[PDB]
Amino acid sequence: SSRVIVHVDLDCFYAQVEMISNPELKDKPLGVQQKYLVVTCNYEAGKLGVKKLMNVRDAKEKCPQLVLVNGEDLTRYREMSYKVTELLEEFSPVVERLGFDENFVDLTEMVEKRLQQLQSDELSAVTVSGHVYNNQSINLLDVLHIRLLVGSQIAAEMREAMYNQLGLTGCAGVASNKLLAKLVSGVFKPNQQTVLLPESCQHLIHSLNHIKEIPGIGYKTAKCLEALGINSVRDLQTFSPKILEKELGISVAQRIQKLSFGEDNSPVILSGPPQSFSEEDSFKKCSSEVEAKNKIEELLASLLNRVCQDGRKPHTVRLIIRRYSGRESRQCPIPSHVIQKLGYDVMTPMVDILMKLFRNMVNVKFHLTLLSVCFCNLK
DNA sequence: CTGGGGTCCT
DNA sequence: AGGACCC
Ligand SMILES: Nc1ccn([C@H]2C[C@H](O)[C@@H](COP(=O)(O)NP(=O)(O)OP(=O)(O)O)O2)c(=O)n1
Ligand SMILES: [Mn+2]
Ligand SMILES: [Mn+2]
């Protein structure tokens, strides 16, 4: 009952796409910028001291020759993301999306088929593809080792098909659950892959230096844990289950403490088509209801094109704003006749609705720093 | 000088 | 509606 899971994360995703569009960027330190944030950078810029999510001020301070490309339009990145996901769905149907650039694939059934097609003379010729975490020795008589090696071969075929068909590189990790497959994928970067044999699990789990590095333990949970003297993976491993339950609830406590041991029972879920579409816009200041109406119009145009391309109709609309110096949202169902009309001047009705919601949140009789629109409840 | 997105749970 | 998490 031991699964084989692969996790794939693309190398400097946005920067890789922009480097594909303009090959002249391939040999220069490249950073992809959104507002005042260098959201990612190619390997050249990373060598010169630029890091992901660094200030544009600090990024040019570390590397003044940095070339900057605007990436506030995620259209290309989204297209390429779904091409990667589809290509992986060619291998096994059940592919889970995390972010635009990460995918889990459950290789168990495929691995089993490959092993059944094999015979004894070949069964000793099974070899790993890529790195083995911690240089750990392979025991070809351990069925888990054999299955994970086959999983590494499948992962290699996946990366190669990604480069040949899509011109994209990434790192893969092969393990027995999603947490470990994600934790081991980034050990060797970029454009490499790593397989984790069971014997090294604990090693991996103890190579982390704080609990926030565990997928599942975010900012709030991390701060609450720090408030209890829990700072290492082993602190959380050994901490009292009961105090943990009282401090975080039963759910969070049991899940994250089981995560501290490298145990992740969660299955790989079919992500399928998106559950929502949304567009954002940030600014230093918004003070005019007419200006807010214009920005909202902008968001609506692109969202309408996207939904029209999708072929499904959203049955709920949401408006989100941020106030000066928290985020607030109002949503409502989309009228049925507008839903059927999708594909007339749908603009005007939609703008009227979202303006009504806006007035519900804001008093025209202000200073806003974020306007966002969402289409959810897709059919 | 802190983006532009997504998921699910309450 | 808001909040936790993910990239
Ligand atoms: N907070 C974040 C994190 C990622 N992203 C976008 C930019 C990234 O190119 C893309 C993937 O994020 P990422 O995997 O965390 N780092 P990236 O893939 O750029 O480089 P690697 O570290 O994976 O080589 O999502 C973002 O816009 N905001
Ligand atoms: Mn990633
Ligand atoms: Mn990545």
CATH of the domain at A268: 1.10.150.20
**A41 CA closest ligand 1 atom index:** 19
Nucleotides in chain C with any atom closer than 7 Å to protein CB: 1-7
Question: In A199-208, which positions are buried (b, 16+ CB within 10 angstroms) versus exposed (e)?
Answer: ebbeebbeee
Structure tokens that stand for A170 in this block: 């990434």
Q: Are residues A126 and A261 in the same domain?
A: no
Residues 6+ apart with CB under 8 A from A116: none
**Percent helix, percent strand, percent coil in chain A, to nearest 5:** 45, 20, 30
Dist. CA A276–CA A297, nearest whole Å = 19
CB distance A231 to A207 below 8 Å: no
Structure tokens that stand for A104 in this block: 């889990």
Q: Which nucleotide is nearest to A73 (CA to C1')?
A: B4
Dist. CA A51–CA A29, nearest whole Å = 12
Q: Among A273, A303, A331, which residue terminates a domain?
A: A273
Q: Are residues A79 and A165 in the same domain?
A: yes
Cis amide bond preceding A190, omega within 30: yes
Q: Are residues A3 and A151 in the same domain?
A: yes
CB distance A150 to A111 below 8 Å: yes
Q: Among A174, A196, A218, which residue terminates a domain?
A: A196
Question: How many of the other CB atoms lie within 10 Å of CB of A55?
Answer: 12
Q: Which nucleotide is nearest to A278 (CA to C1')?
A: B5
Hey, what's the torsion of the CAs at A159, A161, A166, A172, to 10 degrees? -10
Q: Are residues A28 and A41 in the same domain?
A: yes
Residue A317's domain is classified under what CATH number?
A: 3.30.1490.100
Residue A42's domain is classified under what CATH number?
A: 3.40.1170.60
DSSP string, A293-318: HHHHHHHHHHHHHHHHHH---EEEEE
Q: Among A73, A91, A117, which residue terminates a domain?
A: A73
CB distance A190 to A19 below 8 Å: no
- Strand C–CB A327 distance below 7 A: yes
A245 is catalytic: no
Max Cα-Cα span within chain A: 82
Q: Are residues A202 and A160 in the same domain?
A: no
In short, whether A215's Cβ falls inside 6 Å of ligand 1 is no
Residues 6+ apart with CB under 8 A from A312: A273, A378, A379
Instruction: Write out the residue range of the structural domain in which residue A323 sits.
Output: 274-379
> How many CA atoms, within 13 angstroms, populate the side-chain half-sphere of residue A354?
28
Q: Are residues A159 and A226 in the same domain?
A: no
- Strand C–CB A215 distance below 7 A: yes
Task: Name the domain count of chain A.
Answer: 4
Going by C-alpha positions, the residue among A42, A72, A45 that lies closest to residue A59 is A45
Q: Are residues A189 and A105 in the same domain?
A: yes
Q: Are residues A266 and A323 in the same domain?
A: no
Per DSSP, what are the bridge partners of residue A333? A316
CB distance A256 to A245 below 8 Å: no
The alpha-helical segments, DSSP class H, found in A249-288 are 250-259
Method by which this entry was solved: X-ray
- Write down the catalytic residue from A86, A102, A157, A298: A102
Structure tokens that stand for A35 in this block: 């507002």
Nucleotides in chain B with any atom closer than 7 Å to protein CB: 1-10
Q: Are residues A159 and A172 in the same domain?
A: yes
Distance from residue A112's CA to nucleotide B3's C1', rounded to whole Å: 43
* Strand ranges of the sheet holding A37-41, from the earlier edge strand across to the other edge: A54-55, A37-41, A30-34, A67-70
Dist. CA A365–CA A337, nearest whole Å = 32
Q: Are residues A146 and A6 in the same domain?
A: yes
Q: Which ligand is nearest to the CA of A186?
A: 1
**Taking the C1' atom of B2, which residue's CA lies nearest?**
A37
- Please count the helices (runs of H) and the strands (runs of E) in chain A: 16, 14
A193-195 and A170-175 as β-strands: parallel, antiparallel, unpaired? parallel
CB distance A171 to A12 below 8 Å: no
Q: Are residues A16 and A40 in the same domain?
A: yes
Q: Which nucleotide is nearest to A274 (CA to C1')?
A: B6
CB distance A110 to A116 below 8 Å: no
CB distance A297 to A353 below 8 Å: no
Dist. CA A361–CA A126, nearest whole Å = 62
**Tokens 């600090």 sit on residue:** A58
Helix axes A143-166, A108-117, angle to 10 degrees: 110
Q: In this structure, which residue's CA is closest to atom 24 in ligand 1?
A: A11
Dist. CA A355–CA A227, nearest whole Å = 43
Resolution (A): 2.8
Residues packed against strand B, CB within 7 Å? A 34-37, 39, 53, 55-58, 72, 74, 78, 97, 99-100, 251, 269, 271, 274-282, 372, 374
Q: Are residues A42 and A106 in the same domain?
A: no
